[PDB]
């Protein structure tokens, strides 16, 4: 049970070789939605 | 959650010191209170920042939560209370086992989207054989050492 | 007097110091097991008594000095055993 | 007490912090001194849940024992000040900053008792050092003795510990993210309990050994009672039923392994099936790694 | 007569008959209570029953003071015949009063149930428990005393 | 005057049941206190008055407070009993004078004594050196205890006077019926210049 996890380690490693910080344009699109949301709530407040 | 606030002279803001209520604070951004913080942070008050002072004497005080010189290791549960525990678990092992075979035949003949959304009766999979073995074991191992240790300690 | 595992007395061993034959001694132990001076059991067939607990009674400065070293002796057992599971167990586990 | 109206005294963390803050309020050159406050709390069974406390101006001669001063008027003002803020806050006792008991204590216990019968002391420490809790609880009872000496106001020990609320919980939680104690999982947590327990037995016994050695030589008049109890101790040690006990203990262990065996085995099979899952996911990831 | 039945000490049926049979014959209740012990209509079943209760009192005490015991010795601690004293033990065994186990060919009664592990170790555990607590009260006692002799 | 901390030491003793003064010396003691407190809340507009006992283990019945009305209301329920002590009482008086609002008040003890003192003079004139350090003034009112006592208290009040005659003075009250000696011998006009 220590042995076969210690060899199971390698399959996860090939996947980590695949990006695990990818889809940065999704996150940048969300960030461009939080500037529209921030001001959506200053306009639902209706307060400057 | 704990903030701090200080009102700001709204009059002086109207008079042109509106960009002059900026004292030099650091920052970290808030939102859900933008309700009254859009004229709060930016008209009526602002955000102070909070810290703490973790003394070492207070830390060595709170750190206390167990007086064990009569707890475990000088005790151990009842050995007829402890067999009635094993009985129950190691029977539940059987019940779960069967369903486990029936899951290993299924997963083989299906694609991971249908085993993904499989959230009806979580009693079937690994999750419960692990959930068990780590309570069972624990128990028992130590269940285990407690008896031995006392045999020498109070020899 | 008997300090150890050896805590059994034989009927014909009590009777000789109690000055009475072995047909009184039975009752005699039963009054003790009643008032409480003794807790335990008579094993009549093999002529044994089981002296499990005997009320305390005052000691002097010479008996205490022996208890000190009897207790000391137990202390170092504890010390060494703690030192057994600080090595190994505490080391890794925490 | 003989009364089942006291037993578990449970002090919440903010009290501990409160007496440890009080000990530095006075702390100028008046430090190195017993400081005393009153314990506010609630209770309704075998408990005395302590919650709030506030220093009471207190002085005490450093060589005499009948020269102690305690502004009880201050109490009859503040007690109401805090009642006016929280109902259900009677005076359930009073705390005394250790390091241990003083002859004078009993005197105090009767100038605090003029409020609430059952008042208890709660010796709290101003120095972390003990490995058990820094919270010992005493009650002022009285008894008769087989030696025929006049009745006395002694002090009797009752078990103690600290508890918490959600509030308390969370504040403490917040204050110990520096000294993390959660990285440690279950199994090891309880091994810790069983080594740390010997760390207690060891020093308790050690203290009795220093006492016995203290009366035997370097004389300190014998108190027959201590030695009495100390005999029950050596009769209770597990010994006289040696052979049989052996043959049984071995058997119960045997069972224990049987079930450990099963546990570790299932664990193994499950982990291995996990591995098969990794290998197959790797093959099908290798068909994708090709393509275009 | 009640001070005999409360304490835990066996009673001779002969010493009971002697120094009390004259108290159960003068001033008795043979009509104000319907033959407490007089006559022979029901007043005989009464003696027989009283004898039972006396003797089974004795057995009930055997169960706290004996593991083994010889059959012969038992008969003299019951003042019954050596043969009638197995016939009188069944009245209690099967039933619900002390299921002591006898061996006839042996001559031995055993008032100790078979010892299994759960017993033996749950006694070891009781003792380590009380041992622990007792060390606690000891250290607190020594503490208290420290204050009287060093005069704090 | 200046704002001061006053400590009324009243005595409990079997001697406080003598008809040799105003009806019973108990009652009379009460009246005397009632005047010496009131008379030091009009010298200054603010002035803290205490009230301890001098018997058994010397005790506090009220700490420093400006209300003469508490000083008179606890004082009703005393009882003549016990054997007084001067040592214990004085020493608890300091501990009561330290704790006060404001540290500009002066330390003054107004002490009434009334039964033979059983402490030797050697210890009393050690306490008077510790009071000389602590700058404690102490007036001793011999309401009795002058013919049944050779005044060790003379060497007590002269241990506090290196040169000042107000630093500490032992006031006597003639032991006759003397209605008019417990009112003029008061410490606010016996051993000082002020009389307000």
Swiss-Prot record, chain A:
The gene is PSMD3. Residues 15-39 have a biased composition (Basic and acidic residues). This is 26S proteasome non-ATPase regulatory subunit 3. Component of the 19S proteasome regulatory particle complex. The 26S proteasome consists of a 20S core particle (CP) and two 19S regulatory subunits (RP). The regulatory particle is made of a lid composed of 9 subunits including PSMD3, a base containing 6 ATPases and few additional components. Interacts with UBQLN1 (via ubiquitin-like domain). Interacts with ERCC6. Component of the 26S proteasome, a multiprotein complex involved in the ATP-dependent degradation of ubiquitinated proteins. This complex plays a key role in the maintenance of protein homeostasis by removing misfolded or damaged proteins, which could impair cellular functions, and by removing proteins whose functions are no longer required. Therefore, the proteasome participates in numerous cellular processes, including cell cycle progression, apoptosis, or DNA damage repair. Residues 14-48 are annotated as: Disordered. The lineage of its organism: Eukaryota, Metazoa, Chordata, Craniata, Vertebrata. Belongs to the proteasome subunit S3 family.
Swiss-Prot record, chain B:
GO terms for molecular function: endopeptidase activator activity; K63-linked deubiquitinase activity; metal ion binding; metal-dependent deubiquitinase activity; metallopeptidase activity; proteasome binding. The modification Phosphoserine is found at residue 69. The keyword Metal-binding applies. Transmembrane segments: none annotated. GO terms for cellular component: cytosol; cytosolic proteasome complex; extracellular region; ficolin-1-rich granule lumen; nucleoplasm; nucleus; proteasome accessory complex; proteasome complex. Widely expressed. Highest levels in heart and skeletal muscle. The keyword Zinc applies. Keywords: DNA damage, DNA repair, Hydrolase, Metal-binding, Metalloprotease, Phosphoprotein, Protease, Proteasome, Ubl conjugation pathway, Zinc. The modification Phosphothreonine is found at residue 111. GO terms for biological process: double-strand break repair via homologous recombination; double-strand break repair via nonhomologous end joining; proteasome-mediated ubiquitin-dependent protein catabolic process; protein deubiquitination; protein K63-linked deubiquitination; regulation of proteasomal protein catabolic process; response to ethanol; ubiquitin-dependent protein catabolic process. It comes from the Eukaryota. Its EC number is 3.4.19.-. Belongs to the peptidase M67A family. PSMD14 subfamily. This is 26S proteasome non-ATPase regulatory subunit 14.
From Swiss-Prot, chain E:
Residues 1-116 form the PCI domain. Keywords: Acetylation, Intellectual disability, Isopeptide bond, Proteasome, Ubl conjugation. The modification N6-acetyllysine is found at residue 64. The keyword Metal-binding does not apply. The keyword Ubl conjugation applies. GO terms for cellular component: cytoplasm; cytosol; extracellular exosome; extracellular region; ficolin-1-rich granule lumen; membrane; nucleoplasm; proteasome accessory complex. One of its GO terms (biological process) is proteasome-mediated ubiquitin-dependent protein catabolic process. Component of the 19S proteasome regulatory particle complex. The 26S proteasome consists of a 20S core particle (CP) and two 19S regulatory subunits (RP). The regulatory particle is made of a lid composed of 9 subunits including PSMD12, a base containing 6 ATPases and few additional components. Interacts with ERCC6. Component of the 26S proteasome, a multiprotein complex involved in the ATP-dependent degradation of ubiquitinated proteins. This complex plays a key role in the maintenance of protein homeostasis by removing misfolded or damaged proteins, which could impair cellular functions, and by removing proteins whose functions are no longer required. Therefore, the proteasome participates in numerous cellular processes, including cell cycle progression, apoptosis, or DNA damage repair. Belongs to the proteasome subunit p55 family. This is 26S proteasome non-ATPase regulatory subunit 12. It comes from Homo sapiens. The chain holds residues 305 to 456 of 456 of the full protein.
UniProtKB/Swiss-Prot annotation, chain F:
The gene is PSMD4. Residues 5-188 form the VWFA domain. GO terms for biological process: proteasome-mediated ubiquitin-dependent protein catabolic process. One of its GO terms (molecular function) is polyubiquitin modification-dependent protein binding. The chain holds residues 1 to 196 of 377 of the full protein. Component of the 26S proteasome, a multiprotein complex involved in the ATP-dependent degradation of ubiquitinated proteins. This complex plays a key role in the maintenance of protein homeostasis by removing misfolded or damaged proteins, which could impair cellular functions, and by removing proteins whose functions are no longer required. Therefore, the proteasome participates in numerous cellular processes, including cell cycle progression, apoptosis, or DNA damage repair. There is a cross-link at residue 122 (Glycyl lysine isopeptide (Lys-Gly) (interchain with G-Cter in SUMO2)). GO terms for cellular component: cytosol; nucleoplasm; nucleus; proteasome accessory complex; proteasome complex; proteasome regulatory particle, base subcomplex. Component of the 19S proteasome regulatory particle complex. The 26S proteasome consists of a 20S core particle (CP) and two 19S regulatory subunits (RP). The regulatory particle is made of a lid composed of 9 subunits, a base containing 6 ATPases and few additional components including PSMD4. Interacts with NUB1. Interacts with SQSTM1. Interacts with UBQLN4. Interacts with UBE3A. Interacts with UBQLN1 (via ubiquitin-like domain). Interacts with DDI2. Coiled coil: none annotated.
């Amino acid at each position: 049970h220590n042995m076969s996890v210690k060899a199971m380690r390698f399959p996860p490693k090939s996947y980590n070789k695949d990006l695990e910080s990818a889809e940065e344009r999704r996150e940048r699109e969300q960030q461009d939605l939080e500037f529209a949301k921030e001001m959506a709530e200053d306009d639902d407040d209706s307060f400057p | 959650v704990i903030d701090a606030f200080r009102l700001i002279n709204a009059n002086m803001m109207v008079l042109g010191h509106e960009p002059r209520q900026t004292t030099s604070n650091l920052g970290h951004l808030n939102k859900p209170s933008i309700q009254a913080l859009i004229h709060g942070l930016n008209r009526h008050y602002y955000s102070i920042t909070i810290n703490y002072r973790k003394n070492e004497l207070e830390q060595k005080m709170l750190l206390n939560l167990h007086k064990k010189s009569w707890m475990e290791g000088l005790t151990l549960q009842d050995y007829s209370e402890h067999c009635k525990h094993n009985e129950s678990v190691v029977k539940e092992m059987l019940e779960l086992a069967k369903n486990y075979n029936k899951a290993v035949e299924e997963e083989d003949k299906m694609t991971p989207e249908q085993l993904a959304i499989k959230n009806v009766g979580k009693q079937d999979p690994k999750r419960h054989l692990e959930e068990h073995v780590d309570v069972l074991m624990t128990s028992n191992i130590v269940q285990c050492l407690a008896a031995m240790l006392d045999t020498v300690v109070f020899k | 007097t008997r300090p150890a595992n050896h805590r059994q007395l034989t009927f014909e061993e009590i009777a000789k110091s109690a000055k009475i034959t072995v047909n009184e001694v039975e009752l005699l132990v039963m009054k003790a097991l009643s008032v409480g001076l003794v807790k335990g059991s008579i094993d009549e067939v093999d002529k044994r008594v089981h002296m499990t607990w005997v009320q305390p009674r005052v000691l002097d400065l010479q008996q205490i000095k022996g208890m000190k070293d009897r207790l000391e002796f137990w202390c170092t057992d504890v010390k060494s055993m703690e030192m057994l599971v600080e090595h190994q167990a505490h080391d890794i586990l925490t | 007490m003989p009364e089942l109206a006291v037993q578990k005294v449970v002090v919440h963390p903010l009290v501990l912090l409160s007496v440890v803050d009080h000990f530095n309020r006075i702390g100028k050159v008046g430090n190195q001194k017993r400081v005393v406050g009153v314990l506010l709390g609630s209770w309704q069974k075998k408990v005395l849940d302590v919650s709030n406390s506030f220093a009471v101006p207190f002085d005490e001669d450093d060589k005499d024992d009948s020269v102690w001063f305690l502004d009880h008027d201050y109490l009859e003002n503040m007690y109401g000040m805090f009642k006016k803020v929280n109902a259900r806050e009677r005076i359930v006792g009073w705390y005394h900053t250790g390091p241990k008991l003083h002859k004078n204590d009993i005197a105090i216990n009767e100038l605090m008792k003029r409020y609430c019968p059952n008042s208890v002391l709660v010796i709290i420490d101003v120095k972390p050092k003990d490995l058990g809790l820094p919270t010992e609880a005493y009650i002022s009872v009285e008894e008769v003795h087989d030696d025929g000496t006049p009745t006395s106001k002694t002090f009797e020990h009752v078990t103690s510990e600290i508890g918490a609320e959600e509030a308390e919980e969370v504040g403490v939680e917040h204050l110990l993210r520096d000294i993390k104690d959660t990285t440690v999982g279950t199994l090891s947590q309880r091994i810790t309990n069983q080594v740390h327990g010997l760390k207690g037995l060891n020093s308790k016994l050690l203290d009795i050994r220093s006492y016995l050695e203290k009366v035997a030589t370097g004389k300190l008049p014998i108190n027959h009672q201590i030695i009495y109890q100390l005999q029950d101790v050596f009769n209770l040690l597990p010994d006289v039923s040696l052979q049989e006990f052996v043959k049984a203990f071995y058997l119960k262990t045997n069972d224990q392994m049987v079930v450990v065996y099963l546990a570790s085995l299932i664990r193994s099979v499950v982990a291995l099936h996990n591995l098969i899952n990794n290998k197959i996911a790797n093959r099908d990831a290798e068909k994708k790694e090709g393509q275009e | 007569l009640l001070k005999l039945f409360t304490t835990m000490e066996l009673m001779r049926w002969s010493t009971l008959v002697e120094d009390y049979g004259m108290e159960l014959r003068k001033g008795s209740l043979e009509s104000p209570a319907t033959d407490v012990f007089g006559s022979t209509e029901e007043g005989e079943k009464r003696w027989k029953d009283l004898k039972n209760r006396v003797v089974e009192h004795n057995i009930r005490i055997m169960a706290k003071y004996y593991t083994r015991i010889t059959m012969k010795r038992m008969a003299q601690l019951l003042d019954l015949s050596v043969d009638e004293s197995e016939a009188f033990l069944s009245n209690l065994v099967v039933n619900k009063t002390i299921f002591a186990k006898v061996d006839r060919l042996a001559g031995i009664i055993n008032f100790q149930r078979p010892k299994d592990p759960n017993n033996l170790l749950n006694d070891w555990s009781q003792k380590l428990n009380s041992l622990m607590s007792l060390v606690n009260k000891t250290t607190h006692l020594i503490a208290k005393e420290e204050m009287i002799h060093n005069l704090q | 005057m200046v704002l001061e901390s006053t400590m009324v030491c009243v005595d409990n003793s079997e001697y406080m049941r003598n008809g040799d003064f105003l009806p019973t010396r108990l009652q009379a003691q009460q009246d005397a206190v009632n005047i010496v407190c009131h008379s030091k809340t009009r010298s200054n507009p603010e002035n803290n008055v205490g009230l301890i006992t001098l018997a058994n283990d010397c005790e506090v019945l009220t700490t420093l407070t400006p209300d003469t009305g508490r000083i008179l209301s606890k004082l009703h329920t005393v009882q003549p009993k016990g054997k007084i002590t001067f040592c214990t009482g004085i020493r608890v008086a300091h501990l009561a004078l330290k704790h006060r609002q404001g540290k500009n008040h002066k330390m003054r003890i107004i002490a009434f004594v009334g039964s033979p003192v059983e402490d030797n003079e050697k210890d009393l004139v050690k306490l008077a050196k510790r009071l000389k350090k602590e700058k404690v003034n102490v007036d001793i009112i011999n309401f009795g205890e002058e013919e049944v006592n050779t005044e060790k208290l003379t060497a007590f009040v002269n241990t506090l006077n290196g040169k000042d005659g107000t630093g500490s003075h032992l006031v006597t009250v003639p032991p006759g019926p003397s209605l008019a000696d417990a009112l003029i011998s008061s410490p606010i006009l016996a051993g000082e210049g002020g009389a307000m």
